[PDB]
Amino acid sequence: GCAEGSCYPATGDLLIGRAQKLSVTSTCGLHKPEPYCIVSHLQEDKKCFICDSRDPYHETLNPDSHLIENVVTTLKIWWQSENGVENVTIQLDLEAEFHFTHLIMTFKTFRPAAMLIERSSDFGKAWGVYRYFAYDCESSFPGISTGPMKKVDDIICDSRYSDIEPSTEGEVIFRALDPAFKIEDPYSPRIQNLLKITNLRIKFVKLHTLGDNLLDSRMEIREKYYYAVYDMVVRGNCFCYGHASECAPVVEGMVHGHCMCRHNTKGLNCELCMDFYHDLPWRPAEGRNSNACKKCNCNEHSSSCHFDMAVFLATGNVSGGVCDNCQHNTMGRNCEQCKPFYFQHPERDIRDPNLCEPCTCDPAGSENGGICDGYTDFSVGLIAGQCRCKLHVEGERCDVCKEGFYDLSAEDPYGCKSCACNPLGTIPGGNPCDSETGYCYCKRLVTGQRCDQ
Numbered sequence: 001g002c003a004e005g006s007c008y009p010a011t012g013d014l015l016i017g018r019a020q021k022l023s024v025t026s027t028c029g030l031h032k033p034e035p036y037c038i039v040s041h042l043q044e045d046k047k048c049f050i051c052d053s054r055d056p057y058h059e060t061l062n063p064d065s066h067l068i069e070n071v072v073t074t075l076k077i078w079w080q081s082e083n084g085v086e087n088v089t090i091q092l093d094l095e096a097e098f099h100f101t102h103l104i105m106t107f108k109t110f111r112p113a114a115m116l117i118e119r120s121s122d123f124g125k126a127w128g129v130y131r132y133f134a135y136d137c138e139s140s141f142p143g144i145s146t147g148p149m150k151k152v153d154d155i156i157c158d159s160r161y162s163d164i165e166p167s168t169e170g171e172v173i174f175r176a177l178d179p180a181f182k183i184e185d186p187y188s189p190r191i192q193n194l195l196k197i198t199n200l201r202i203k204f205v206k207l208h209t210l211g212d213n214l215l216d217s218r219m220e221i222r223e224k225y226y227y228a229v230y231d232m233v234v235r236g237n238c239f240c241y242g243h244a245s246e247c248a249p250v251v252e253g254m255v256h257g258h259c260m261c262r263h264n265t266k267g268l269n270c271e272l273c274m275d276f277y278h279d280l281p282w283r284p285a286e287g288r289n290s291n292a293c294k295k296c297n298c299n300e301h302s303s304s305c306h307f308d309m310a311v312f313l314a315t316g317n318v319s320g321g322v323c324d325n326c327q328h329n330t331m332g333r334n335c336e337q338c339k340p341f342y343f344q345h346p347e348r349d350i351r352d353p354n355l356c357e358p359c360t361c362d363p364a365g366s367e368n369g370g371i372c373d374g375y376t377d378f379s380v381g382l383i384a385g386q387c388r389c390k391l392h393v394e395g396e397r398c399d400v401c402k403e404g405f406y407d408l409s410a411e412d413p414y415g416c417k418s419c420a421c422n423p424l425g426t427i428p429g430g431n432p433c434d435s436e437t438g439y440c441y442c443k444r445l446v447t448g449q450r451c452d453q
């Protein structure tokens, strides 16, 4: 179970439950009845019938309809192209984004003379070519390679499925991950650009005529050459990087496309980290390792955080979440400090909403605009609150002139100005002057500010 490590949804047939998503290029009997023939082994004999494909097949009402929706299995139904048409294309459209195992088509007539398979990850915008197939990889597909594959993603031209010999029920097969390889790293960029699929597309380009030149011929010669397909399975699954055990609707036997993520992951494919769980870098599960996204810690002064790789490494791959918009005047990568002009109450829990107290330093007399010590830490000379008074100021809040000085003006570096009280004419003992006026207390028979005159 996911509650024990990595986990993945079941595999299945993508076509099931998705019949109405199939679209063709040619289909005998769409508008008005067309006839056809079933040649045998080397043209021994031929029996012909009619193709009335203008109404959904039914065994006892309309037995000659052969629309593409007839490939999705669950008797003998099928799809069939127009007689003598050599350019037919089938297309599957997925609502979500799935992983592709393998495709298995079984024709009723004679497997294509030559065909190729394409796909799209970016919803029918860009198209990649999985592989080519032919009986003459050189005439039909000049340039494309044959022989062996130099890489697990080499586009080549197969031919083991483009014969004739198998009269009917012949099969075409394609596997995303060429069995002839060892998938070293699963989640790698290339092994991924092989399974990623939203749109499958099969293009037929050559019909086996057994000699006859369909080129301007009697409806008697072409009426026997056409692609017909009994059914086809598109094996695959809904990918969730190990973080989900089952996918939900975006029925029966149907492969769903919405990952029911777990492990604090969120996303259509759980490739993201649930909100506020950005303390470790997102990773896919493996073995019993969930690699579950880790909850951020902002000491309860936020709930918006993001993951920063630099920080992650800086801590030795321990943690990399940094908090956003620290509330309560806190600060720090985890909101574990107080912004200037505030200081941590010596008591209070670091999680307390009021952990941070405002300074009380009088800006004019203090040093550093009146920023107090933010927290206590003897070893360095830090006390929660303590203000740094200027040279000639004193008091818990630095709002007082030291004896002998006056005029606490913020406008100056040291705060107060020396009274400059003459030692002679000034009454000795206690404060020699007014802290405001700067007027010294003079002896008798002496006068004037500085008790000099």
Ligand SMILES: *[C@@H]1O[C@H](CO[C@H]2O[C@@H](C)[C@@H](O)[C@@H](O)[C@@H]2O)[C@@H](O[C@@H]2O[C@H](CO)[C@@H](O[C@@H]3O[C@H](CO)[C@@H](O)[C@H](O[C@H]4O[C@H](CO)[C@@H](O)[C@H](O)[C@@H]4O)[C@@H]3O)[C@H](O)[C@H]2NC(C)=O)[C@H](O)[C@H]1NC(C)=O
Binding pocket: 281, 282, 283, 309, 313, 316, 317
């Ligand atoms: C702390 O974690 C970081 C983050 O990345 C890892 O995070 C963990 C949680 C998992 O998610 C894990 O899968 C992530 O990789 C680590 O930093 C990264 O470490 C990987 C190690 O594989 C680095 O990848 C390598 O990069 C070099 C240089 O670009 C490549 O050469 C390697 O690929 C080939 O190297 C030679 C080629 O001749 C041959 O051995 C093979 O051909 C190799 O395939 C390989 O890709 C990646 O660059 C690192 N990225 C960062 C973040 O700088 C980090 O190591 C870890 N610290 C610790 C605990 O040591």
Ligand SMILES: *[C@@H]1O[C@H](CO)[C@@H](O)[C@H](O)[C@H]1NC(C)=O
Binding pocket: 087, 088, 205
């Ligand atoms: C079929 O493909 C040929 C080239 O191979 C092209 O000339 C022709 O126009 C195509 N016919 C279709 C599908 O309209």
